[PDB]
Design an enzyme around this catalytic site. Structure first.
Site, PDB file in Angstrom:
ATOM      1  N   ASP A   9       0.821  -1.174   0.000  1.00  0.00           N
ATOM      2  CA  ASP A   9       0.000   0.000   0.000  1.00  0.00           C
ATOM      3  C   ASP A   9       0.880   1.259   0.000  1.00  0.00           C
ATOM      4  O   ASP A   9       2.036   1.241   0.440  1.00  0.00           O
ATOM      5  CB  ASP A   9      -0.914  -0.020   1.235  1.00  0.00           C
ATOM      6  CG  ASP A   9      -1.833   1.169   1.293  1.00  0.00           C
ATOM      7  OD1 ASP A   9      -2.515   1.436   0.294  1.00  0.00           O
ATOM      8  OD2 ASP A   9      -1.868   1.877   2.326  1.00  0.00           O
TER       9      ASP A   9
HETATM   10 CL    CL Z   1      -5.504   2.332  -0.986  1.00  0.00          CL
HETATM   11 MG    MG Z   2      -3.336   2.926   3.155  1.00  0.00          MG
END
Ligand code: CL
Ligand code: MG
Ligand code: CL
Length: 223
Positions: A9
């Protein structure tokens, strides 16, 4: 075990999105000559989080999330606003913020030498490319998988399938996902058959690992 592929991420995992957002909101409200109170910030965050969650669950488009959050917020404070115009201004400010999570650059720099690194994100591609570049993280990733290119979004199994098909010699068993969202990253990845590492510095679905600082990944990955 020995992972070969790491899915990161971006926002609040390796980039300090909270910081970027704090500045961009102030600059948006300065631009609009609207006083921004601590209560208004708190409501923004509940509204924004609620919209993103609705998108994640497939009840809303991402365009709607971003183009209504500010009109919805301001409505509660007595202002009628063009949501789309405010998002355009906000976006321009947000893209200037490329603050890093503590230790991110060093970590990603070292991990690139031993693993193949991929980005997995629901954020706006223009925004994510610019901040990844300005922060110095960009060159370390082999590919970037943004929701907008897939027809789906984290946590959906079809988003992770799109990613897996496009990673050469993909092996689920030798793949770790690292992210701050319990629902988008951790539950998405686990349902998609992956080990998970929950980035949770503020100590708020069981992940394989839970960490406070990115530097804890040196021990988890044996290096
Ligand atoms: Cl995200
Ligand atoms: Mg995040
Ligand atoms: Cl955003």
């Amino acid at each position: 075990k020995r992972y070969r592929t790491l899915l990161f991420d971006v926002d609040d995992t390796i980039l300090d999105f909270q910081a970027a957002e704090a500045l961009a909101l102030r600059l948006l409200f300065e631009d609009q000559n609207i006083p921004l109170t601590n209560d208004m910030k708190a409501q923004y965050k509940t509204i924004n989080q609620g919209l993103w969650r609705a998108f994640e669950e497939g009840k809303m488009t991402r365009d709607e999330v971003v183009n209504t959050r500010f009109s919805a917020l301001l409505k509660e404070y007595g202002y009628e606003a063009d949501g789309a115009l405010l998002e355009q201004k906000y976006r321009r400010f947000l893209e200037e913020g490329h603050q890093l999570i503590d230790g991110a650059f060093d970590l990603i720099s070292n991990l690139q030498q031993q693993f193949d690194l991929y980005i997995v994100t629901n954020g706006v591609s223009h925004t994510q490319y610019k901040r990844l570049r300005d922060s110095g993280l960009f060159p370390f990733f082999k590919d970037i998988f943004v929701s907008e290119d897939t027809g789906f979004q984290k946590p959906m199994k079809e988003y992770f399938n799109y990613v897996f098909e496009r990673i050469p010699q993909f092996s689920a068993e030798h793949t770790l996902i690292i992210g701050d969202s319990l629902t988008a990253d951790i539950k998405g990845g686990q349902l998609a058959g992956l080990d998970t590492c929950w980035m949770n510095p503020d100590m708020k679905i069981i992940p394989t690992y839970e960490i406070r600082k990115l530097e804890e990944l040196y021990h988890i990955l044996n290096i």
